[PDB]
Amino acid sequence: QALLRILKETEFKKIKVLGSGAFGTVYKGLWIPEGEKVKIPVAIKELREATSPKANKEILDEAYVMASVDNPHVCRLLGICLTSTVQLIMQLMPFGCLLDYVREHKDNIGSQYLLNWCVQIAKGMNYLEDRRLVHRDLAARNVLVKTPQHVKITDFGLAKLLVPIKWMALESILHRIYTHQSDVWSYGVTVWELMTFGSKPYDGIPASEISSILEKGERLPQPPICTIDVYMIMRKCWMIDADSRPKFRELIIEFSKMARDPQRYLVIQGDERMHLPSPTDSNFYRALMDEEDMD
Amino acid sequence: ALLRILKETEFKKIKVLGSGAFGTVYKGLWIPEGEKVKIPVAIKELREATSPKANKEILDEAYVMASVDNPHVCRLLGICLTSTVQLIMQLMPFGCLLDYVREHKDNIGSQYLLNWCVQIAKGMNYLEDRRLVHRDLAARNVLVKTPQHVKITDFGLAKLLGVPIKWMALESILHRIYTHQSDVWSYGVTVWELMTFGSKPYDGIPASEISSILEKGERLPQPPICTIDVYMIMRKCWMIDADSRPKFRELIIEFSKMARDPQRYLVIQGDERMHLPSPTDSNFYRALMDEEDMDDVVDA
Ligand SMILES: Nc1ncnc2c1ncn2[C@@H]1O[C@H](COP(=O)(O)OP(=O)(O)NP(=O)(O)O)[C@@H](O)[C@H]1O
Ligand SMILES: Nc1ncnc2c1ncn2[C@@H]1O[C@H](COP(=O)(O)OP(=O)(O)NP(=O)(O)O)[C@@H](O)[C@H]1O
Ligand SMILES: O=C1c2ccccc2Nc2ccc(F)cc2N1Cc1ccccc1
Ligand SMILES: O=C1c2ccccc2Nc2ccc(F)cc2N1Cc1ccccc1
Ligand SMILES: [Mg+2]
Ligand SMILES: [Mg+2]
């Protein structure tokens, strides 16, 4: 509705490449409101290839859906520009994606942060399930860091408009089946990424051979910091039978309980020197970079 | 809790935005320790106060400014007392409302002007609830977060440290009395600034002559776009009897009433296309730079 803004190409500018994925390239950009002098930082995603205006109508229809999400842990699509190559606008996250964040702060991340991130990602996916929106490309690279205390899911629904083998449920690899329960499989891999501080899953195994090892019962290994309870949640996300996997609602509760006693469920060297920010640092971050309400 | 104490090594001044009577404001960057991000901030290096102040006294006063909670009042965010007194607040890329109205002279619709009057009155009424006297209210001390959302700034600076004769109530000029009712006078001048698109009040008249012309009953003239209804509000703000002036609570009500029929109370050429932004453009502004939501815009 009024949730998605249609932008003129003349009101924004690319200033820096942030990266590229399977579906396009993301830029740091500036929005210049017409008739104003200000330059507002934004993220711009230029799709991999140019689309006909017939295809644009379909891109537009789904863009309205993605612009309609309202949840503190889900990124909302903000605008679109229907140039020959479609350009999409969302809020710029200066901290980048959670995968890069955990790699940059490897070891230096306390159990309180890791478990809270699992809670927040589960909340965002539970919301998407409520909307009947299947992500299809959940991974640590598609969780953005708004502040170190507040992460948000991005890039949902993109994959079905326009293949991350090592994050997909077996049935998605074999039969192109994508459901909320196959998203749960990808959730488990995302948690594994966090708990290993950004390790590549199935490192050294060709993607063409992942489905065979999954059929034989092979799974991602137990991260060194994960207790039996944390790793069992992850293993349950990877059950062959999709209906045997946990619900995102169940995951919220499980990780919330664990986050109330983090040192019991993650064993991290020097965890006693790491910290969840002080109310002083929490208020400062919010006023500067995060004024949306959240738990 | 509310006021962050900063190390000088976690922020840097980048550019002067301007200076007033109380210090210099910079566009700056906050660099969280152990992080790689650089977050734009506003940094104000205060000049020296005319009275001696201990570090604790400065901190105690800063905490009061950090404790305000209202959508139309800027909150002090951080402080660094090593070098000079340096304060950190949110950077407003649109700048102050005075510069904004001058920059969009004759291009501003009645809904914007009247809603700004509502929002400033709301912020001042909150400050009055907290017993905080501004002493330096003016269009330059209303900041634009978005064109739809303005916020009062720089309250309390004048009493912490050491000029704005043309914005001060008569009792402030003559006897240095500063109250919430003298703030109402300055509010009246601020409204006059907006309605004249940023004209200098008493232009070409020395400040030494302001009290004389006020005592003789002369006031700032009626802005061309103002109906008498709006101009009467300004005149009431400038009554010699301080207790006779409107209360900020009354100003909220009156200007909110006018904003429900904006073209009835302001006469602006081409006013019909200068409406408040569409729900599409409001959501875009809010998501990008104003997640505080509460624009507080009463609409025709
Ligand atoms: N809103 C954003 N703010 C800041 N950085 C972003 C934003 N969106 C994406 N990025 C980054 O831009 C780069 C490109 O992301 P993207 O194009 O989605 O590829 P990807 O997420 O790594 N792989 P995939 O999404 O599965 O195709 C990544 O480094 C992201 O972390
Ligand atoms: N938070 C802010 N974000 C952006 N610009 C700001 C901010 N605070 C102040 N400024 C601007 O920085 C300049 C310096 O402001 P300031 O030092 O308060 O002088 P002044 O407000 O014009 N006069 P006065 O406050 O009465 O002494 C002005 O151009 C302001 O508009
Ligand atoms: O590409 C997309 C995107 C495009 C079309 C349909 C769904 C999509 N999924 C999505 C969901 C929420 C969000 F907030 C951003 C996206 N994005 C990523 C994006 C968009 C603009 C700028 C940078 C990145
Ligand atoms: O100086 C001050 C300020 C300093 C001391 C006491 C009161 C003060 N009043 C005030 C109130 C709210 C606000 F949000 C900012 C201020 N400011 C202005 C400022 C601070 C940091 C950077 C730029 C400008
Ligand atoms: Mg992505
Ligand atoms: Mg000022």
XYZ file of C-alpha atoms and ligand atoms in Angstrom:
707
model
C 0.000 0.000 0.000
C 1.568 3.218 1.257
C 4.258 1.009 2.801
C 6.479 0.848 -0.322
C 7.810 4.019 -1.821
C 8.334 4.425 -5.506
C 11.491 6.463 -6.090
C 12.776 8.477 -9.025
C 16.264 7.514 -10.122
C 17.281 11.152 -9.652
C 16.653 11.135 -5.868
C 19.349 8.632 -4.809
C 22.999 7.886 -5.592
C 25.377 4.955 -5.146
C 28.485 5.884 -3.145
C 30.086 2.566 -2.111
C 29.788 -1.120 -2.965
C 29.008 -3.216 0.099
C 28.929 -6.616 -1.587
C 27.207 -8.947 -3.993
C 25.257 -12.160 -3.606
C 23.381 -14.558 -5.859
C 20.617 -12.050 -6.631
C 22.383 -8.706 -7.046
C 24.745 -6.097 -5.643
C 24.233 -4.020 -2.495
C 25.480 -0.432 -2.311
C 25.774 2.171 0.348
C 23.795 5.058 -1.101
C 22.453 8.491 -0.307
C 18.829 9.550 -0.528
C 18.293 13.179 -1.516
C 14.685 14.233 -0.877
C 13.477 16.367 -3.754
C 13.679 20.051 -2.940
C 16.015 19.382 0.024
C 19.791 19.588 0.686
C 20.213 16.600 2.928
C 21.907 13.349 2.003
C 20.423 10.403 3.893
C 22.425 7.140 3.927
C 20.570 4.100 2.586
C 21.231 0.596 1.326
C 20.542 -0.014 -2.373
C 20.205 -3.465 -3.907
C 20.580 -3.594 -7.687
C 19.277 -6.886 -9.067
C 21.706 -9.190 -10.954
C 20.059 -8.629 -14.343
C 17.730 -6.166 -16.013
C 14.076 -7.091 -16.232
C 11.349 -6.360 -18.748
C 8.511 -4.129 -17.496
C 6.303 -7.219 -17.646
C 8.601 -8.875 -15.106
C 8.793 -5.608 -13.136
C 5.065 -5.861 -12.402
C 5.727 -9.184 -10.662
C 8.742 -7.721 -8.840
C 6.487 -4.837 -7.803
C 3.737 -7.135 -6.492
C 6.152 -8.973 -4.215
C 7.930 -5.761 -3.210
C 4.642 -4.555 -1.706
C 4.465 -7.746 0.371
C 8.051 -7.358 1.597
C 7.305 -3.714 2.424
C 4.385 -4.784 4.652
C 6.365 -6.598 7.369
C 6.272 -4.956 10.816
C 8.429 -6.692 13.445
C 11.499 -5.474 15.383
C 13.602 -8.413 14.128
C 12.590 -8.314 10.443
C 13.938 -5.795 7.941
C 11.275 -3.938 5.968
C 11.694 -3.143 2.289
C 11.298 0.624 1.995
C 11.417 1.599 -1.666
C 11.945 0.491 -5.236
C 13.116 2.142 -8.450
C 11.905 0.513 -11.641
C 14.814 1.329 -13.890
C 15.835 -1.185 -16.550
C 17.702 -2.868 -13.707
C 15.453 -2.843 -10.640
C 16.907 -1.041 -7.628
C 15.565 -1.611 -4.103
C 16.044 0.625 -1.047
C 16.133 -0.360 2.629
C 17.692 1.020 5.798
C 21.503 0.994 5.843
C 23.008 -1.194 8.591
C 26.523 0.186 9.246
C 27.448 -2.884 11.320
C 26.781 -5.154 8.319
C 25.691 -8.772 8.480
C 25.920 -10.991 11.545
C 28.273 -13.474 9.843
C 30.897 -10.763 9.338
C 30.270 -9.459 12.861
C 30.906 -12.774 14.620
C 34.023 -13.379 12.510
C 35.402 -9.931 13.359
C 34.698 -10.415 17.081
C 35.653 -14.099 17.075
C 36.123 -15.442 20.612
C 35.459 -11.869 21.914
C 31.691 -12.593 21.906
C 30.080 -13.643 25.151
C 27.460 -16.336 25.541
C 24.848 -13.691 26.391
C 25.117 -12.160 22.906
C 25.099 -15.461 20.998
C 22.014 -16.813 22.777
C 20.128 -13.508 22.470
C 20.850 -13.482 18.729
C 19.333 -16.966 18.484
C 16.251 -15.660 20.307
C 15.922 -12.633 18.029
C 16.389 -14.603 14.798
C 13.785 -17.115 15.987
C 11.374 -14.261 16.753
C 11.833 -12.813 13.270
C 11.301 -16.168 11.564
C 8.232 -16.861 13.708
C 6.827 -13.557 12.455
C 7.562 -14.502 8.839
C 5.799 -17.828 9.411
C 2.826 -15.909 10.823
C 2.758 -13.949 7.548
C 3.033 -17.231 5.609
C 6.280 -15.883 4.142
C 8.915 -18.510 3.408
C 12.423 -17.079 3.488
C 14.321 -19.694 1.389
C 17.719 -18.033 2.024
C 18.139 -17.768 5.782
C 21.794 -17.753 6.856
C 24.101 -15.729 9.079
C 24.892 -13.553 6.053
C 21.182 -12.654 5.858
C 20.917 -11.510 9.471
C 21.890 -7.850 9.725
C 23.315 -6.145 12.811
C 21.430 -2.943 13.592
C 23.293 -2.629 16.889
C 25.279 -5.398 18.611
C 22.177 -5.916 20.782
C 19.607 -5.964 17.964
C 19.675 -8.143 14.839
C 17.125 -8.348 12.025
C 16.408 -10.877 9.272
C 16.787 -9.649 5.690
C 16.423 -10.894 2.101
C 13.327 -13.041 2.704
C 11.261 -13.761 -0.401
C 14.018 -12.634 -2.778
C 15.041 -16.187 -3.742
C 11.545 -17.120 -4.952
C 11.297 -14.058 -7.212
C 14.460 -14.522 -9.245
C 21.128 -21.971 -4.589
C 22.544 -22.059 -1.011
C 22.928 -25.842 -0.954
C 24.715 -25.990 2.399
C 21.867 -24.139 4.179
C 18.919 -25.946 2.556
C 16.769 -28.734 3.939
C 17.159 -32.071 2.171
C 13.705 -31.848 0.574
C 14.591 -28.443 -0.884
C 17.712 -29.875 -2.541
C 15.929 -32.985 -3.813
C 12.474 -31.733 -4.814
C 12.586 -27.894 -4.678
C 10.205 -27.933 -1.692
C 10.364 -24.759 0.411
C 8.281 -24.467 3.583
C 8.527 -22.833 6.986
C 9.963 -26.141 8.213
C 12.709 -26.068 5.581
C 13.418 -22.558 6.871
C 13.843 -24.233 10.273
C 16.622 -26.337 8.746
C 18.351 -23.158 7.554
C 17.838 -21.690 11.034
C 19.831 -24.560 12.533
C 22.721 -23.920 10.152
C 22.607 -20.202 10.995
C 22.899 -21.045 14.695
C 25.830 -23.327 13.869
C 27.492 -20.412 12.049
C 27.126 -18.211 15.140
C 28.346 -20.848 17.600
C 31.438 -21.546 15.465
C 32.095 -17.786 15.125
C 31.440 -17.837 11.389
C 32.840 -21.154 10.168
C 31.930 -22.326 6.685
C 29.460 -25.240 6.983
C 30.614 -28.548 5.480
C 33.972 -26.959 4.700
C 35.790 -28.941 2.019
C 32.742 -30.924 0.834
C 31.479 -30.004 -2.669
C 27.924 -28.678 -2.670
C 26.999 -31.232 -5.351
C 27.602 -33.990 -2.773
C 25.810 -32.473 0.254
C 22.519 -34.293 -0.368
C 24.245 -37.693 -0.364
C 25.928 -37.114 3.008
C 22.646 -35.825 4.449
C 20.806 -38.969 3.308
C 23.527 -41.010 5.047
C 22.809 -39.149 8.285
C 25.858 -36.871 8.379
C 25.354 -33.483 10.027
C 27.340 -30.407 10.970
C 29.595 -31.132 13.964
C 29.092 -29.967 17.521
C 30.667 -26.508 17.973
C 33.331 -26.541 20.710
C 31.400 -24.008 22.829
C 28.010 -25.761 22.579
C 26.737 -27.947 25.406
C 24.624 -31.024 24.690
C 21.375 -29.050 25.071
C 22.339 -26.359 22.544
C 23.644 -28.837 19.957
C 20.539 -31.029 20.298
C 18.313 -28.103 19.298
C 20.454 -27.693 16.180
C 20.338 -31.414 15.373
C 16.547 -31.411 15.717
C 16.338 -28.668 13.071
C 18.014 -31.131 10.679
C 15.624 -34.081 10.988
C 14.859 -35.705 7.640
C 11.152 -35.625 8.505
C 10.204 -31.947 8.251
C 7.352 -32.317 10.749
C 9.846 -33.642 13.320
C 11.744 -30.340 13.332
C 10.991 -27.776 16.068
C 8.681 -24.821 15.571
C 10.125 -21.314 15.570
C 7.840 -20.628 18.547
C 9.461 -23.531 20.388
C 12.912 -22.201 19.461
C 12.099 -18.774 20.929
C 11.213 -20.378 24.263
C 14.168 -22.781 24.284
C 16.834 -20.155 23.573
C 15.171 -17.595 25.865
C 15.435 -20.038 28.773
C 19.080 -20.676 27.900
C 19.776 -16.942 27.645
C 18.632 -16.614 31.265
C 21.603 -18.807 32.286
C 24.047 -18.447 29.380
C 27.157 -19.878 31.060
C 25.286 -23.150 31.640
C 24.649 -23.695 27.928
C 27.741 -22.237 26.224
C 31.283 -22.827 27.488
C 33.470 -19.961 26.233
C 37.015 -19.152 27.316
C 37.074 -15.841 29.148
C 33.281 -15.494 29.131
C 33.580 -13.755 32.510
C 35.280 -10.765 30.850
C 32.642 -10.398 28.125
C 29.505 -8.452 28.843
C 26.015 -7.555 27.704
C 26.006 -3.748 27.474
C 25.143 -1.585 30.420
C 21.850 0.333 30.460
C 23.982 3.420 29.804
C 25.433 1.903 26.633
C 22.012 0.557 25.663
C 20.368 3.984 25.794
C 23.235 5.611 23.881
C 23.046 3.077 21.036
C 19.261 3.388 20.783
C 19.241 7.192 20.661
C 22.006 7.232 18.031
C 21.131 4.260 15.794
C 18.020 2.410 16.978
C 14.864 4.289 17.984
C 12.424 1.463 17.184
C 10.813 -0.293 20.137
C 11.771 -3.857 21.041
C 11.844 -6.214 24.017
C 21.968 5.461 32.763
C 20.777 8.354 30.605
C 24.062 10.294 30.200
C 26.960 8.395 28.635
C 30.451 9.432 29.722
C 32.738 9.334 26.686
C 36.455 8.931 26.257
C 37.990 11.470 23.894
C 39.358 8.511 21.890
C 35.870 7.264 20.964
C 34.727 10.364 19.041
C 36.185 12.926 16.624
C 35.127 16.364 15.439
C 35.005 16.598 11.642
C 33.484 19.946 10.687
C 32.145 23.118 12.256
C 28.408 23.513 11.715
C 28.219 26.847 13.506
C 28.632 28.725 16.739
C 26.314 30.664 19.003
C 26.634 32.464 22.306
C 27.418 29.276 24.241
C 29.861 27.255 22.130
C 30.688 25.669 18.798
C 28.758 22.793 17.219
C 30.569 20.233 15.075
C 29.517 17.404 12.864
C 31.360 14.491 14.445
C 31.775 10.735 14.494
C 31.330 8.294 17.350
C 33.618 5.265 17.107
C 32.594 2.545 19.575
C 35.649 0.879 21.060
C 36.255 -2.550 19.578
C 34.024 -1.730 16.595
C 34.764 -0.507 13.073
C 31.684 1.652 12.490
C 31.676 5.451 12.450
C 28.371 6.955 13.586
C 27.609 10.625 12.802
C 26.910 12.772 15.863
C 26.659 16.422 16.822
C 29.365 17.668 19.188
C 29.084 20.979 21.060
C 32.257 22.325 22.721
C 31.041 24.816 25.315
C 32.849 28.063 25.916
C 33.696 28.980 29.495
C 30.917 29.904 31.890
C 30.942 33.323 33.494
C 30.642 31.598 36.938
C 33.136 28.947 38.098
C 31.769 25.417 37.808
C 33.192 22.197 39.203
C 33.224 19.095 37.006
C 30.562 17.531 39.244
C 28.315 20.591 38.853
C 28.627 20.382 35.066
C 27.815 16.656 35.237
C 24.811 17.210 37.505
C 23.414 19.832 35.109
C 24.140 17.639 32.085
C 22.201 14.733 33.599
C 19.087 16.905 33.875
C 19.352 17.652 30.154
C 19.858 13.928 29.489
C 16.714 13.015 31.453
C 14.047 14.719 29.301
C 11.666 12.334 27.491
C 9.400 14.000 24.920
C 9.135 13.677 21.107
C 9.565 17.448 20.655
C 12.541 17.962 22.991
C 16.106 17.019 22.090
C 17.830 14.828 24.676
C 21.456 15.269 25.681
C 23.169 11.941 24.994
C 26.783 12.098 26.165
C 29.497 14.232 27.706
C 33.301 14.398 27.804
C 34.847 16.542 30.556
C 38.572 15.862 30.096
C 39.617 18.656 27.746
C 36.848 21.256 27.431
C 33.226 20.450 28.166
C 32.017 18.531 25.111
C 28.453 17.270 24.671
C 27.114 14.660 22.260
C 23.613 14.697 20.803
C 21.891 13.314 17.738
C 23.023 14.901 14.480
C 20.143 16.625 12.650
C 21.054 16.758 8.927
C 18.203 19.200 8.209
C 19.653 21.719 10.676
C 17.599 24.261 12.577
C 14.082 25.371 11.677
C 15.178 28.976 11.047
C 17.539 27.885 8.273
C 14.861 25.522 6.971
C 12.121 28.162 6.652
C 14.528 30.612 5.009
C 15.663 27.898 2.618
C 12.045 27.047 1.669
C 10.775 30.651 1.759
C 7.300 30.926 0.196
C 7.418 27.131 -0.463
C 5.959 26.093 2.930
C 2.322 25.116 3.375
C 0.040 26.182 6.203
C -0.173 22.621 7.549
C 3.590 22.616 8.106
C 3.747 26.064 9.736
C 0.792 25.470 12.067
C 1.926 21.954 13.017
C 5.384 23.325 13.813
C 3.714 25.827 16.150
C 1.880 22.921 17.796
C 5.042 20.842 18.197
C 7.127 23.679 19.656
C 4.330 24.442 22.124
C 4.171 20.744 23.054
C 7.912 20.616 23.699
C 7.847 23.814 25.751
C 4.863 22.610 27.788
C 6.858 19.477 28.642
C 9.868 21.584 29.660
C 7.503 23.591 31.861
C 6.239 20.353 33.446
C 9.878 19.601 34.315
C 10.364 23.192 35.614
C 13.018 23.810 32.957
C 13.189 27.394 31.708
C 14.701 27.612 28.241
C 15.908 31.268 28.213
C 17.037 31.030 24.558
C 14.035 29.828 22.585
C 14.116 30.996 18.958
C 13.723 29.478 15.509
C 17.461 28.733 15.558
C 16.905 26.533 18.640
C 14.226 24.362 17.058
C 15.844 21.509 15.143
C 14.315 19.704 12.169
C 14.455 15.934 12.577
C 12.258 15.599 9.497
C 10.196 18.360 7.852
C 7.233 16.814 9.705
C 8.930 16.611 13.112
C 10.716 19.435 14.949
C 12.329 19.364 18.394
C 13.431 21.995 20.908
C 17.152 22.145 21.689
C 19.659 24.124 23.768
C 17.392 24.582 26.793
C 19.211 25.260 30.056
C 22.466 26.352 28.398
C 21.895 30.027 29.215
C 21.556 29.335 32.949
C 24.502 26.940 33.018
C 26.860 29.473 31.445
C 26.682 33.204 30.730
C 22.407 38.469 24.038
C 19.107 37.414 22.375
C 17.494 40.733 23.315
C 15.010 40.594 20.431
C 13.618 37.255 21.655
C 13.441 38.110 25.367
C 10.437 39.238 27.368
C 10.502 42.811 28.653
C 10.971 41.660 32.253
C 14.001 39.630 31.147
C 15.622 42.663 29.493
C 14.922 45.005 32.402
C 15.358 42.750 35.461
C 16.889 39.462 34.180
C 13.762 37.574 35.268
C 13.463 34.248 33.440
C 10.308 32.161 33.845
C 8.146 29.875 31.749
C 6.050 32.966 30.993
C 9.072 34.815 29.615
C 9.624 31.715 27.467
C 6.121 32.323 26.075
C 7.281 35.726 24.819
C 10.214 34.064 23.044
C 7.746 31.522 21.671
C 5.771 34.409 20.181
C 8.885 35.748 18.463
C 9.697 32.224 17.254
C 6.241 31.958 15.667
C 6.768 35.350 14.016
C 10.036 34.033 12.543
C 8.260 31.022 11.026
C 5.383 33.047 9.583
C 7.817 35.525 7.976
C 9.968 32.654 6.616
C 12.926 33.631 8.768
C 12.951 37.428 8.778
C 15.183 39.087 11.335
C 12.979 40.604 14.069
C 13.373 44.362 14.561
C 15.747 44.388 11.601
C 18.097 47.360 11.720
C 17.023 48.383 15.237
C 19.803 48.295 17.874
C 19.145 45.906 20.746
C 19.551 48.807 23.196
C 16.313 50.276 21.777
C 14.108 47.177 22.092
C 12.922 47.839 25.649
C 12.046 51.437 24.748
C 9.961 50.482 21.704
C 8.268 47.728 23.729
C 7.367 50.154 26.525
C 5.818 52.477 23.915
C 3.549 49.617 22.795
C 5.271 48.793 19.509
C 5.524 45.143 18.481
C 6.705 43.023 15.587
C 4.392 43.588 12.600
C 1.701 41.271 11.301
C 3.195 38.774 8.818
C 1.480 39.022 5.413
C 0.409 35.351 5.420
C -1.143 35.560 8.894
C -4.816 36.135 9.415
C -5.584 38.324 12.417
C -6.332 35.166 14.441
C -2.713 34.013 14.276
C -1.356 37.527 14.805
C -3.509 37.941 17.925
C -1.778 34.892 19.414
C 1.635 36.508 18.880
C 0.421 39.809 20.345
C -0.813 38.021 23.470
C 2.602 36.392 23.893
C 4.098 39.909 23.985
C 1.957 41.452 26.737
C 3.838 43.406 29.401
C 1.949 41.539 32.141
C 3.676 38.149 32.156
C 0.757 36.370 33.828
C -1.548 37.702 31.110
C 0.284 35.782 28.383
C -1.101 32.451 27.155
C 0.119 29.247 28.726
C 1.896 26.725 26.515
C -1.034 24.361 27.140
C -3.390 26.953 25.647
C -1.079 27.472 22.664
C -1.154 23.722 21.940
C -4.955 23.817 21.861
C -5.290 26.968 19.762
C -2.765 25.999 17.086
C -4.079 22.421 16.949
C -7.533 23.882 16.306
C -6.153 26.068 13.507
C -4.267 23.127 11.974
C -7.606 21.334 11.438
C -8.528 24.073 8.921
C -5.090 25.425 8.002
C -6.043 27.488 4.939
C -8.598 29.412 7.025
C -5.890 30.896 9.271
C -2.923 31.301 6.883
C -3.119 32.790 3.381
C -0.398 31.234 1.223
C -0.228 31.333 -2.574
C -0.235 27.796 -3.954
C -1.039 26.408 -0.498
C -3.127 23.606 -2.016
C -0.208 21.419 -3.162
C 1.929 22.080 -0.052
C 0.028 19.521 2.064
C 1.614 17.188 4.633
C 3.369 14.217 2.987
C 1.366 11.254 1.786
C 1.180 8.170 4.020
C 3.674 6.677 1.561
C 6.191 9.488 2.016
C 5.615 9.687 5.777
C 6.406 5.998 6.240
C 9.554 6.374 4.128
C 10.837 9.335 6.169
C 10.000 7.583 9.445
C 11.727 4.323 8.518
C 14.876 6.095 7.285
C 15.432 8.854 9.851
C 12.623 8.982 12.416
C 11.646 5.712 14.102
C 10.370 7.760 17.072
C 7.100 7.743 15.015
C 5.142 10.397 16.951
C 5.179 13.175 14.375
C 2.153 14.730 16.148
C 0.612 16.137 12.977
C -2.997 17.249 13.158
C -4.436 17.148 9.653
C -7.305 19.114 7.988
N 20.710 -3.091 4.550
C 22.013 -3.375 4.510
N 22.872 -2.573 5.181
C 24.178 -2.854 5.145
N 24.804 -3.852 4.515
C 23.929 -4.628 3.859
C 22.560 -4.466 3.804
N 21.974 -5.458 3.028
C 22.996 -6.182 2.640
N 24.209 -5.743 3.105
C 25.516 -6.331 2.844
O 25.790 -6.205 1.462
C 26.442 -7.396 0.968
C 25.629 -7.997 -0.154
O 24.571 -8.804 0.401
P 23.711 -9.767 -0.510
O 23.575 -9.151 -1.849
O 22.360 -10.094 0.132
O 24.576 -11.101 -0.579
P 24.556 -12.196 0.531
O 23.572 -11.877 1.607
O 25.957 -12.256 1.203
N 24.238 -13.683 -0.176
P 22.606 -13.923 -0.573
O 21.718 -12.889 0.043
O 22.187 -15.355 -0.061
O 22.438 -13.872 -2.145
C 26.663 -8.300 2.179
O 27.978 -8.131 2.693
C 25.598 -7.822 3.169
O 26.013 -8.027 4.514
N 22.094 18.512 16.956
C 22.381 19.293 15.911
N 22.380 18.745 14.675
C 22.672 19.519 13.627
N 22.980 20.819 13.606
C 22.975 21.335 14.842
C 22.694 20.658 16.019
N 22.787 21.516 17.104
C 23.113 22.667 16.572
N 23.241 22.631 15.207
C 23.601 23.742 14.332
O 24.917 24.146 14.655
C 25.022 25.586 14.635
C 25.470 26.087 15.989
O 24.340 26.174 16.881
P 24.418 27.011 18.222
O 25.801 26.903 18.743
O 23.347 26.585 19.228
O 24.108 28.501 17.764
P 22.666 29.088 17.700
O 21.652 28.068 18.095
O 22.359 29.506 16.234
N 22.589 30.451 18.677
P 22.380 30.130 20.330
O 22.049 28.697 20.604
O 21.224 31.062 20.865
O 23.720 30.486 21.087
C 23.674 26.108 14.143
O 23.713 26.344 12.741
C 22.711 24.973 14.501
O 21.610 24.928 13.602
O 16.502 -7.410 -2.216
C 15.628 -7.477 -1.418
C 14.229 -7.971 -1.872
C 13.763 -7.604 -3.160
C 12.514 -8.047 -3.599
C 11.722 -8.858 -2.775
C 12.183 -9.229 -1.516
C 13.458 -8.782 -1.088
N 13.879 -9.178 0.266
C 14.058 -8.129 1.285
C 13.178 -8.151 2.400
C 13.308 -7.157 3.366
C 14.276 -6.149 3.226
F 14.391 -5.180 4.181
C 15.124 -6.132 2.117
C 14.992 -7.143 1.127
N 15.897 -7.117 -0.037
C 17.265 -6.714 0.262
C 17.614 -5.250 0.029
C 16.675 -4.347 -0.436
C 17.045 -3.025 -0.628
C 18.342 -2.612 -0.362
C 19.279 -3.518 0.105
C 18.911 -4.838 0.297
O 24.831 22.301 24.626
C 23.864 21.777 25.054
C 23.662 21.797 26.588
C 24.809 21.699 27.421
C 24.645 21.753 28.807
C 23.369 21.916 29.365
C 22.254 22.037 28.540
C 22.426 21.988 27.136
N 21.207 22.085 26.309
C 20.812 20.961 25.435
C 19.581 20.308 25.715
C 19.203 19.232 24.913
C 20.027 18.796 23.862
F 19.646 17.742 23.085
C 21.236 19.438 23.606
C 21.626 20.532 24.426
N 22.904 21.194 24.136
C 23.206 21.321 22.717
C 24.136 20.323 22.041
C 24.679 19.235 22.702
C 25.516 18.371 22.009
C 25.805 18.593 20.671
C 25.254 19.680 20.012
C 24.422 20.544 20.703
Mg 21.699 -11.313 1.463
Mg 21.428 26.755 19.530
